Ligand binder design. Structure first.
Ligand code: BCO
Ligand code: BCO
Lengths: 360, 360
């Protein structure tokens, strides 16, 4: 199996959102990932490409046989991933204490939203709920409108799965010293708060307000925002540093002498009006050509459907084709032990067959 | 130093955005992190709390001595982080090969936006630019308006720092088996694409469209969006599963038989108007109480300045007081080798002191 995590053995108690995304990435990087779903499920081969780089098995964990077969897998594995409410694995007999008794090298990885304790620990939730409580959702969107969810990118994945991964991998480094596994408690409400640590830092030094749409990085700055072009499509501008901003102005055809200062916030309305009129005078693909190879920090805002035609995306092989649809290649990249293309979702496998393969 | 990464040694060449965030998380989890800045930028004790859990040393890397001293650090370290454009470390004589001569065990970690090669590889950029090229930015915001940046959470942090971290820690694992370091190439355009793999999967199965504001998780669904309340503050609704959705309607006082089906998308505008009126008739705190302990997936949308008063936040100690204000505690959490509270940014120390501390 190709990639730096070759040899790593992972058991995933099937769930939704972050836990499968973490499991996918370990698979992506060469880990041997075995996914236990319930049998009331899997109608053949999955169409869900997030379940790539997996072996799927089924098992009623409520039954005695199911539980015993699960515990045999966990006994021979490096990592367990579960993302059910706190208490579910305990009551099923697969809690950390029970797993510790059959394999004290195990990394026991618990993926939740609210965490393992506290008043909300049993409420159902999704990404939008977890980022609503820690101040993040309130900060996203235009000032004159209600907050808008940044898909499920910030809570599920960026503040969820990715912190789960860092915990798993940090714990595996620690196990090199101690010879011992441990519990990783990854909560989306905590992870996402660390993801936005910058804003908490800037807020302490008066460089970030709670007012939505009135900061440097939320769309409030005329030089960090999107602009509509002549054709109704968009470019993005990210010209924070004065030398990049000057390059953008020159490319737009505006003399610095006619505009207000870049960071005179009281004249941002005027500046936005000027940039708006200038970007609106040609189409997105015009601006893309003008600004290619420049430090102006102006790029076209591509729709998913157009991404496959962008030279820089093509050349670095950011995507691969699979089942009438492009998919992202593994990230990040490794000089010596490169990842390979992902394997598609396979037909279910028998759980004894895995135990035998794992040397049993 | 508490945490699973006790005894990991990390040299950070000072940059902006993702590299410092990764370095911070390594520190947070107990790595020994030494940050090399240039003498011209360091003034008093640094007031950017993203520079917590570091030792700061200055060193003109363009000088012969600065270079020599830095190669002596790298010699004694496990990981090097650099976030400059490609070519930059090479010309300093700190490139991956100069480093492999003094330490073939080093994990050489390169944090860029566009990658190591390809047509955009020397282009300046920020978060908003990296996410504009791969479909992500186009998908964020309301449909009748231009895309809005989700702060810098998706490119720098979620698809940036976090993948550098997964790469550093996966390579340390590969290394335990091979004796050898390697180069980790973390490109924000790649990481952020993997971060949004769920949407690529969903597009292939016809379950996601390129139309902004017309999807389950982008704000188009009336049951996954924010609503304004009687006091002008907001709640978030994330009631995807029908049972949770049903529980939400009952608490709004709405008879499910009077409403269009949850997932009849042609009638979503109509459903939204009914839910809008319901949520508008009481204030945020009313709804927060009404739905406490519920599975209705309705949560108050708090501003940063209110987060310190939320019981679930207080009781799990997601934050600690510092400096000007609250900052997020390390994530994720570990049962045996637990992180400790972050050490503030300390004063600059001399690079010889450090080399004493690390031996040769
Ligand atoms: C769709 C995008 C996702 C997002 O945006 S992230 C949102 C999801 N949130 C999380 O994942 C955080 C933690 N998880 C949760 O809060 C809950 O799992 C979630 C998602 C609310 C779903 O709630 P429920 O459906 O109530 O599930 P739960 O966690 O309370 O318990 C799971 C039930 O499944 C059972 N189970 C799981 N694997 C099984 C197996 N192989 N065989 C037999 N039974 C199995 C388990 O026994 C439990 O059922 P029960 O309570 O015992 O009736
Ligand atoms: C504010 C929010 C941030 C976001 O939203 S993320 C966006 C940032 N993008 C990235 O970090 C991607 C990779 N980095 C870059 O593209 C560039 O570094 C970036 C951010 C465009 C800035 O470009 P430049 O300022 O041109 O910097 P550069 O990386 O090209 O090279 C800088 C020069 O600094 C020099 N330098 C660094 N540390 C030094 C030291 N200790 N002593 C002496 N010289 C030192 C280094 O030699 C380099 O080269 P040179 O002077 O052109 O040869």
């Amino acid at each position: 199996m190709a990639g730096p995590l070759s040899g790593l053995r992972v058991v995933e108690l099937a769930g939704i959102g972050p836990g499968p995304h973490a499991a996918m990435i370990l698979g992506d990087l060469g880990a041997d990932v075995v996914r236990i779903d319930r049998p009331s499920s899997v109608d053949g081969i999955s169409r869900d490409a997030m379940l790539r780089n997996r072996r799927i098995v089924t098992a009623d964990l409520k039954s005695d046989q199911g539980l015993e077969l699960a515990l045999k897998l966990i006994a021979k594995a490096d990592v367990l991933i579960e993302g059910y409410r706190p208490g579910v694995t305990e009551r099923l007999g697969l809690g950390p204490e029970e797993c510790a008794k059959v394999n004290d090298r195990l990394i026991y990885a618990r993926m939740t939203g609210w965490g393992q304790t506290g008043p909300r620990s049993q409420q159902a939730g999704h990404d939008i709920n977890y980022i609503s409580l820690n101040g993040i959702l309130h900060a996203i969107g235009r000032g004159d409108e209600r907050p808008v969810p940044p898909l499920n990118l910030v809570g599920d994945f960026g503040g969820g799965s990715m912190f789960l991964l860092v915990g798993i991998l940090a714990a595996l480094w620690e196990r090199q010293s101690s010879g011992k596994g441990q519990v990783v408690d990854a909560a989306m409400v905590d992870g996402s708060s660390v993801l936005i640590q910058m804003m908490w830092a800037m807020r302490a030094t008066g460089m970030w307000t709670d007012t939505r749409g009135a900061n440097m990085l939320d769309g409030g700055a005329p030089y960090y925002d999107t602009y509509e072009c002549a054709d109704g499509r968009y470019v993005a501008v990210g010209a924070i540093e004065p030398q990049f901003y000057a390059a953008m102005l020159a490319g737009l055809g505006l003399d610095a002498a006619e505009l207000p200062p870049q960071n005179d916030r009281a004249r941002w309305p005027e500046l936005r009006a000027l940039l708006t009129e200038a970007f609106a005078s040609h189409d997105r693909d015009h601006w893309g050509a003008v600004f290619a190879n420049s430090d102006a920090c102006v790029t076209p805002v591509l729709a998913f459907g157009e991404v496959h035609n962008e030279p820089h995306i093509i050349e670095r092989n950011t995507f691969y084709e699979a089942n009438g649809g492009w998919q992202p290649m593994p990230a990040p990249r490794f000089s010596r032990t490169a990842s390979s293309q992902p394997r598609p979702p396979a037909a279910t496998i028998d759980i004894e067959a895995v135990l035998t393969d794992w040397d049993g």
